[PDB]
Design a protein around this nucleic acid. Structure first.
Length: 91
DNA sequence: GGCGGCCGCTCTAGAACAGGATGTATATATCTGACACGTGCCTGGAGACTAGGGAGTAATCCCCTTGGCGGTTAAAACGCGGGGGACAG
């Protein structure tokens, strides 16, 4: 069977930000579980946000609101700016 | 001639300082065991298409929160007495 994993994307992100450092199997498993847990948290927050105002869809504003609700401080603003840059580069 | 005051002497102890002790910080030697590259796939997302439906926007409406007052008696605040408790020892 095939199991979905986030190892290679995290690895190439690491090579982008720090090409002189490697990673282990346990460190990869911690990072995979962390990114998966953040995925469920942000996706559930967006689902609840859609359910509150009778919204049948989840847009980028759902993810931005979930990020500002979950991430505290300047981390939320930096993530919002990165998402806005990615959205503008997408279109 | 006796006694209080003064200064030197020895006793005692706080503390800076140097030496021993033992568990870690490193310098190689070498094992070693997953790390990442390569290969071979192949299974899930992307181009493209069909269709439609829920929100973007406009309009209404009516509703409900903000400003803005006097009044009046509940209470915040200042201060005096004092009292029991936080903390040094």
């Amino acid at each position: 069977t095939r199991k979905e994993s986030y190892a290679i994307y995290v690895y190439k992100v690491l090579k982008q930000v720090h090409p002189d450092t490697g990673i282990s199997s346990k460190a990869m498993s911690i990072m995979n579980s962390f990114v998966n847990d953040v995925f469920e948290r942000i996706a559930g927050e967006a689902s609840r946000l859609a359910h509150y105002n009778k919204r049948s869809t989840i847009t980028s504003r759902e993810i931005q609101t979930a990020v500002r609700l979950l991430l505290p401080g300047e981390l939320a603003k930096h993530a919002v700016s990165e998402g806005t840059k990615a959205v503008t580069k997408y279109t």
